[PDB]
Structure formats: C-alpha cells, structure tokens
C-alpha cells in the first residue's frame, strides 16, 4: 500500500485510485516535491537498451531533487558472471553475486532493466536476476522492465487511458502484431496485469500459439479473431511478443502481416485511440498512417512515463529508513 | 534577444552585446547559477565529441541546470531516419517518434549530427537538425549540424576578440590535409561568423575545395596559401572534404605542403594559431607550431564553455 | 598534509591517524560537508573499465555537493594518440597533448584511471600518462588507478582493516592468486605501500618470479610458502598480478591453482578476515565458500571506497585556489 519496499508488479502500487490521484497531482505541479529526495541517490542499471525508461526515469528523479547515476553494465563496467559455482576463467571478470551488493553500497534506491534471456523459461519467469537485486542489493528495487513485467510502463499506460477515456469503463484491447525478432512478453504480461486490476472491458487478441501465461492473462477475454476483438474498442494497445507455451518459449511462430494494426482494423473500432509503449517498428506493428493519425496518443503516453516514475520514486523515498 | 534556437550566427543577434555577455561570464562564471534552476538540458550525440560534450555540460551547470547526456546508438535504439520504409531490420525505432519523445523530458535540446555525405541536399537542407526543431517541441541548439557549428565559431570569435592586437585583424582560414573526409560545417560556420565581423577575412584552400557561396559570402579566396598567410594576425586551420559537383564529401588531395608548419607561419605578422580540435598533428599543423606560444588552441577550446553558457542563458531567458 | 595538490601515492594523504579520523567522521555523518563542494566540478576520466571506482567516486563527489561529469574516452570521445612527434594519419584523431589541457578547462578536479599498458616497463613505472595529466591538466589530479598504484583503493582497505581489526597491530598477509589474464601490479604495489606505512605485521606471499618492485615491497616480509605466510594471519588480502622482473614484465608465469585462496589456507589463519578489491574471479582467486563465508568483508571493504574518495575529494576541495 503506502509502504512501498519495491516496485515490480501492480500490487506494489496499492490502491489504483489514490495512485492515479498522485499521478495527476504531479502532472499539474511537476516540482511540488523537489525537496523530498534531496541528498538521496538513485542508481539506474541497464542490462539492455533504452530511450524512454532511460530518459524519463532520470527526469523523474530530478523532479524529486534526487541525485542520479546511470550505469550501463557491459559498457563502462566488467562483464558479469550470472551462474554460481562456475570457475570464472573466461569472459567474465566479475560475478553478479558481488556486483549487486556493491552497487547497493553507493545509492539509496535502485532501478534495474533486465530483459528476459529466453534461454530458460523458469529462469526468466522466476525472475531470478531482478530478485537477486531485491535480495542482495540492500536497497529498494524498482523494475525498468524485468523478464516478465514492466510496471513503470503499464502504470503510465493506465494514467494515459484515464487521462483520455471518454467513458468510465472503456473497452481496451491489447493486440499482438508481427515483428522480425523474438521479443519478451514483459510488456503484454504487465499490461494485462494492470488492465485486469481496473474495471475496464479488457480483451486480449493474438494468433494461435501466442497465449500468455495464465497468471497474467487472468480472466481477461482472449479473442483469436483480431477484427472481432477490435470491434467497438476505445483503446488499442498493440505490442509484439515471442511465443511462451511449450516448445516455443521465446520463438517467432509467425510474422503474419495481416495483424499489422492498420487502417482496416482501426475502422472497426469506436474511433479508438492507438497506444504503444515504444520503440515501434513502423509498417510492422502499426501503419505509418495509424501512428500518425490524431487518434494516436503514443507520445502523450510516453510522456506519462515521467509521471509514473515520479510517483513510484516518490513513494519509495517516502518509505526510506 | 528572443532566442528560439541556435544554429546560425543570426540567432545570436548583435555581436557586440553577445561578446559583452561572453566576457561578463568569463569574469563571473556562476553569476547566473540560479537562472536555470529546475530546468533540464538534454544533449544528444549522433557522433563523437570531447569538447562539445564536456564544455556544454559545464556550461549548463554554470546556469544551475540539470543535464542529461544521451548517446544514441550506445544506450538507445538505432533510429530509422527515412519515412515510409518497412522497419523490418536494423532499426527498432523511427526518428519521427524519437524526436518528440526526447522533447518530452527536457526544456532545452542540444544536438550533434555530422553531415552524412550521402546526399548533399539532405545535408545542406539540414534535414535532421530541422526535424528536431520542428518536432522536439523544445528550443534546439546545434552541437554541430551538417553545415554549421555556431557554438564553436561563437567561441572562436570570443577568443579572437580576447587576443587581437588591433581592432580589425587579418584572419585567415586555411585548409589542411587530412586522411579522412570531414564535414565542411566548421569552415562554413567560421566563414559565416567572420563575415559578420569587420575583420579582414581571407579563405585559402586548394583548387576544388570551394565552400558553398552562401557561406563564403564576399570573403577573399586565395588559392596560394603562402600569399594568404602574408601578414595575417590569426590563422584558423581546418580540413574539410570537397563540396562542389561530383566530389561532394570526397578527398581531392592530401597535399602535405598545406600542413600549417613553421614555413607558412613565418610569413604572417607573428599570427596566432587556432583550431577547433580534434587536430591531427603533422597533418593539419606541425608539432612545433601547435606547441609554439602563438598557439592559442587551448584558450580557444576553453572559451567553448563561455559561448555555450551565453547561448544556454539566452535560451533559458526565453523559455515560456 | 593539509596541502593536498594531488592524490596518487600514500604520501599525499599525510598523517594516517588524522586521515582515518576524517574517514570515520564521514562514515558517521555522510553529508556533513555537502556544502563544501558547491559549484565545483569533478571530471572522472576512464581509459579502462570500472564498477566500484566509477560508482563510488560519483557518490563521494555528491556527498560533497559537487558536480560530476564522467567521461569514458574511446566511447563518446576521439581516440587519443599518446606518442609525440608522430604523423597522426591514422587510427587517432586527437593527441593526448591537446586532450589533457582541454579536459582541464571544464572542471576543478580531475580523476583518472589508466591501467598499465604492459608495453614498456619504464613507460608504466615512470607513470607517464598519469603524470602528463598532473603536468598539463592545470587541475589537481587524483588516481582512480594508474599504472603502478591505486591509492583510493588502498586507503579504503586501510579504513576497513582499522574498522575490523581485533588488535592494534594485526598480521596482514597479501597473497598472490592464479588468474587467466595478465593483470597490473598497481593494486599489490599500492597495498604494500600503504601497509608499510602502518605498524601492522605485514607479509607478502607469492610464487617465485612474481617479486614486486623493491620500492613498493619496502622492508615487508616476503614468504614463498603460502601456507606458512597464512599461519595466524588476521587479514588475508588476495590479489593477482602479472610478473614484473626481467624478461617477464607483464606476463603470466603460472596459473598454479594451489594458490587459490580456499578453505585449506584460511584454516591455518587466526580465523582471519578475507579481503579483495574486486572484481574477483571466483574459484580462481578465491573459493565460493571463502568469499561467501562470514569472515569475508569484501563488501564492507568495497563500501569504504566511498569514504576514502569522499575524504580525498574533500581534502582536494579544501585546497582549491
Ligand atoms: C581493481 C582491479 C583492476 C584490475 N583488474 C583487471 O584488469 C581484471 C581483469 C579480469 O578480471 O579479467 C587490476 O588487476 O589492476
Ligand atoms: C519497451 C520494451 C521494448 C522491448 N522491445 C525490444 O527489445 C525491441 C527490439 C526491436 O524492435 O528490435 C520489449 O518488447 O520488451
Ligand atoms: C569539431 C570537429 C568535428 C569534425 N572532426 C572530425 O570528425 C575529425 C575526425 C578525424 O580526425 O578522424 C569535423 O570536421 O566536423
């Protein structure tokens, strides 16, 4: 609730109502709590690339008067050995087991980004890495996208849907789209997780074989007919993700371009808004025209990433010992 | 004094008062440290940089600003620059989304985007730097675009004023041999600014290396290096790849007789040696010349902090 | 002592007693001097990789209210030509002779990391690069590990030994350990240098051939029998380093795994603490069990890097013109 010790799943945010309250409070008065994080240091660690999370999170920290240190492992640091009990006589000069505690020594709050490795479903879904940070960093840890979730993103999506909805409980449809490379299911999982927490009419549509883990799908409606799902929707949340079930974990089952959210599908919606977490591959995930259309709130959405981050960062600060 | 961007000498307005603030700040570096409080500067790099990279952060700090340095390609996603393509490859993100997005998290934007030498029009129409101006939603200042480098030139002006022995010195910009094809942004920019002064400006380069007229202006072009150097008070050496006709962005020569050495300096009125840096020793200039006491290369570089602080200040002062 | 103009060797710190005093003063009140470095800018330059020095030094600077700019040459900047009088018609666009002065132009204090290049002993041991910074930067320079020393690290090791010792003058044993790659002798040299400055019972143990330079070894006891050296020790400081003498400068003479600090050797010590500057290759330098044992103060040690840096940075500030 109001005792945030970490930020990885929607549960951590507590009551959505009051969470959204603070969100809009801050949208209105961006530097209202610029004094709260004074002399508090945030350490942002990146195991993967990032534009939005990278930029938005620093800004957020600044809104709170915090200190920010961005660390891109692999670049300026030493490669990390993730497995325990191995003889470190090669590629890796340092072991994750030392790295984590050490990083925790120089900051107050930690943000981590560690994409699913798609080498072993269990390792990814048990969220081994993000958890080792939680266990051994000795600091509050918030996700900048783990192997199976991306709360900071979803929380922002929530904020923008509330921000733009025309009715109390809109029809929000998350749709799969073709992509050339195998992507994590973190965003979809996370979106579903958050949408299920609302009372919106949530629908998930994807090709056969791309079923997401039940624990995330929840009791949301799954429609295999994209056109049917889109019917009368108020929000379209497009995002690609590699397979998850059985022998296809982390694999591309298809690149059926008929799923590319184009003008054809949008037409069937109730003049719905188009959303996407970004990056977005144009004419793969969505048409140039759709993303450029006025119903596309892609940027406003991205912008809200600063808010969700400022709210989470604030809560974390408020709970620092 | 309502600066909305900073890409060409026009943006600075009256040079006199611009130089005034420059020296004001040289004297009292943190005089306006309170001005940029709670204002965030986003520096974006599409190319390498030491001086611009360092000097601009310091400048922002002098104004009490927040600074975020972003090196695309490194921590971010590769950008697709062309519109209407099917992004099914190398690029995960399109510039059309990237720009607006970056603008979302800052108050002022600084961009560095070297000429790509793939198409003269694309470069000279300054497509990229302009798309930032058009879609970032924030004031944009150049950290060197395809055809200009105001921050650098403005600094060169400051140092010439700072060191000149007479009111209107003879400033000679000279080409020099280089192993790789370099943009003409620095030369173009220097010429642009020198033409704005009332100094005796002269441009000297090998045949074929003529810069665009709009930049050359009505400056004197001398193809005989030794003749140009005669009695000069300032030597501004810099290499640049060809520009005209079928040689856009190409190396026409590496004639080492142009390497600014002791031979040419001797003919000048004990002139100062200047260069924006990086500089390849014994290519652009002799070890001895750059190391000589007439070489104000560092003082020059140092002034990059001032030009940046002045520009950054003006931009802040005009923020809504 | 209160006239710090640089920080590269133990001499620069002055009286160890008062140095340790400030150290613990700051451990207790971390932001006590947060106002001292206001409007002062620190420039950290890296010619090599780093996690601890990279992170700990920024935090330190922040504790002093300073401004921090981290520069990783090679990455965002232009490759530097280190030799003078060459015709720069190749790989290098910029020369070190211009780079150094230029970097000094935009900051108040400079921190440099430049590992030994192992291309020429004299060049390394005369500390040419670190010195050129001192000579031409025009600013106070502190080492983030040069070719032959690493004061920031050693000073921290001192702090932690003082912090954990059970007696006034403990037996501290620095031990060599097998490694797959040729490492600088900067850490060993530096540790010896500092331990020789104390009145602890200092012992150095390494295989034949790995003798460190006399000027660093000082009059410390050198034991070629690891097990003998470990006997009754109170602190074990393990660290690998490539050869130094004669025709083997910067070369791996052996990878004898019998030196891997394991449970076998620890047993012979007076239940000694295990220390290491990190990065550490597990099961090469030290056993998983040893480093994970409770006698392992590896992290507390790393943590102290923030203190040593804050103290040094403070002293430097206090002496700024
Ligand atoms: C703080 C120690 C820095 C460095 N370490 C390395 O270069 C380690 C390389 C490796 O582990 O492969 C050294 O031994 O001097
Ligand atoms: C915001 C998170 C985006 C990330 N996507 C990618 O890694 C994109 C790579 C590509 O488009 O090639 C993902 O699906 O988790
Ligand atoms: C400020 C100067 C930037 C750049 N210089 C280079 O890119 C030189 C590259 C080299 O020397 O290899 C140019 O000519 O525009």
């Amino acid at each position: 609730g109001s005792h945030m010790k970490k930020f990885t799943c929607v549960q951590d945010i507590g009551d959505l109502k009051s969470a959204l309250a603070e969100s809009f409070e801050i949208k209105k008065d961006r530097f209202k709590y610029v004094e709260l994080g004074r002399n508090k240091t945030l350490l942002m660690i990146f195991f993967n690339s990032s534009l939005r999370t990278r930029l938005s999170t620093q800004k957020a920290a600044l809104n709170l008067g915090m200190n920010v240190i961005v660390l891109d492992i692999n670049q300026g640091a030493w490669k990390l050995e993730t497995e325990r009990g191995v003889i470190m006589d090669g590629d890796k000069p340092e072991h994750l087991l030392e790295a984590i505690p050490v990083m925790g020594c120089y900051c107050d709050i930690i943000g981590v980004r560690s994409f699913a490795r798609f080498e072993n479903r269990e390792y990814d879904y048990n969220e081994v890495i993000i958890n080792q940070f939680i266990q051994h960093s000795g600091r509050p840890v918030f996700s900048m996208e783990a192997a199976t979730r991306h709360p900071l993103q979803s929380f922002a999506d929530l904020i923008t849907i509330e921000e733009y909805k025309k009715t109390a409980r809109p029809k929000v449809v998350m749709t799969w789209a073709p992509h050339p490379r195998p992507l994590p299911q973190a965003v979809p999982n996370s979106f579903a997780e958050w949408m299920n927490a609302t009372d919106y009419e949530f629908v998930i549509t994807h090709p056969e074989g791309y079923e997401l883990d039940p624990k995330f799908v929840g009791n949301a409606r799954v429609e295999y007919d994209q056109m049917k799902a889109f019917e009368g929707a108020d929000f379209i949340y497009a995002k690609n993700w590699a397979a998850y079930l059985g022998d296809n974990y982390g694999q591309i089952l298809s690149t059926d371009r008929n799923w590319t959210v184009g003008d054809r599908q949008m037409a069937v919606t109730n003049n719905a808004y188009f959303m996407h977490c970004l990056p977005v591959r144009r004419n793969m995930i969505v048409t140039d025209d759709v993303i450029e259309s006025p119903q596309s709130i892609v940027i406003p959405e991205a912008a809200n990433r600063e808010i969700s981050a400022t709210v989470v960062l604030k809560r974390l600060l408020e709970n620092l010992p």
Side-chain angles (χ1 to χ4, degrees), chain A:
Chain A
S2 59
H3 293 193
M4 194 175 280
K5 306 173 180 158
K6 70 174 180 64
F7 187 65
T8 66
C9 56
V10 66
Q11 285 64 46
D12 296 306
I13 201 61
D15 174 52
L16 291 190
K17 175 190 180 90
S18 58
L20 290 165
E22 293 185 66
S23 294
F24 291 100
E25 187 197 321
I26 297 179
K27 285 192 60 90
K28 243 67 60 83
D29 198 335
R30 208 56 62 73
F31 295 81
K32 181 175 180 172
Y33 302 85
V34 72
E35 274 304 307
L36 177 58
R38 180 180 275 290
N39 292 322
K40 296 299 180 219
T41 302
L42 162 68
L43 172 60
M44 291 168 53
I45 306 168
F46 289 84
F47 283 83
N48 302 78
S49 296
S50 166
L51 206 216
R52 284 145 281 289
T53 304
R54 168 176 260 97
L55 262 32
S56 72
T57 307
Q58 298 185 65
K59 181 59 180 29
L62 292 173
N63 295 329
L64 297 172
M66 292 187 82
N67 286 151
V68 189
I69 299 180
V70 176
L71 185 268
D72 274 279
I73 304 182
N74 304 308
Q75 294 196 46
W78 311 97
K79 285 185 180 102
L80 305 170
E81 171 52 60
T82 182
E83 181 182 3
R84 183 177 134 65
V86 194
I87 294 177
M88 293 175 61
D89 61 5
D91 204 46
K92 285 52 180 242
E94 183 162 15
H95 195 288
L96 187 61
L97 289 179
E98 327 309 333
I100 298 181
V102 178
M103 302 172 127
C105 280
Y106 317 121
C107 57
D108 295 291
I109 300 176
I110 290 182
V112 202
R113 167 165 274 205
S114 183
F115 284 19
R117 310 207 152 176
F118 278 172
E119 289 179 302
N120 175 297
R121 185 179 351 183
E122 255 200 295
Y123 188 75
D124 288 331
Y125 277 67
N126 282 317
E127 291 275 35
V128 176
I129 297 177
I130 181 69
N131 272 306
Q132 282 185 286
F133 270 83
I134 294 177
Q135 250 63 66
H136 318 313
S137 72
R139 306 291 171 171
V141 174
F142 73 83
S143 172
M144 299 187 110
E145 185 176 317
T148 66
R149 301 190 178 70
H150 192 354
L152 280 175
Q153 176 61 56
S154 299
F155 183 12
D157 300 314
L158 181 60
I159 294 174
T160 91
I161 293 179
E162 279 291 301
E163 194 182 71
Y164 283 70
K165 62 176 180 161
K166 263 54 180 298
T167 67
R169 313 148 103 196
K171 176 187 180 115
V172 180
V173 178
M174 171 171 86
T175 180
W176 178 90
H179 192 292
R181 293 165 16 179
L183 307 183
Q185 31 257 178
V187 177
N189 289 337
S190 196
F191 189 69
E193 171 166 292
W194 283 69
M195 296 321 258
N196 281 324
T198 73
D199 57 314
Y200 300 162
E201 175 189 348
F202 184 47
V203 182
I204 298 173
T205 179
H206 61 258
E208 298 250 310
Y210 281 98
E211 359 291 313
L212 296 170
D213 183 305
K215 81 173 180 151
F216 287 111
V217 180
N219 46 53
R221 184 192 138 197
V222 178
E223 180 58 52
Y224 294 77
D225 185 302
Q226 187 183 55
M227 282 294 238
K228 259 211 60 165
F230 272 62
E231 277 182 52
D234 296 301
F235 288 85
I236 293 302
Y237 192 75
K239 178 63 180 116
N240 166 277
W241 70 83
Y244 167 71
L245 294 189
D247 313 305
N248 303 303
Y249 181 62
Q251 290 199 295
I252 297 180
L253 299 189
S254 112
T255 54
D256 181 359
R257 196 163 293 168
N258 283 315
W259 284 76
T260 297
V261 180
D263 200 347
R264 177 178 99 262
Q265 303 97 316
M266 290 309 281
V268 181
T269 72
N270 180 191
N271 191 204
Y273 288 114
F274 177 73
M275 286 173 74
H276 194 298
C277 61
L278 279 48
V280 207
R281 288 162 169 282
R282 295 191 156 208
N283 306 310
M284 271 303 300
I285 299 304
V286 57
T287 299
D288 278 322
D289 299 308
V290 185
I291 199 170
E292 302 186 317
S293 87
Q295 287 62 50
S296 181
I297 51 179
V298 146
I299 275 60
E301 175 177 24
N304 279 161
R305 280 297 299 279
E306 187 190 318
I307 281 56
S308 61
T310 299
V311 175
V312 174
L313 234 35
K314 168 178 179 275
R315 300 283 202 76
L316 289 177
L317 283 170
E318 308 190 302
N319 209 278
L320 284 176

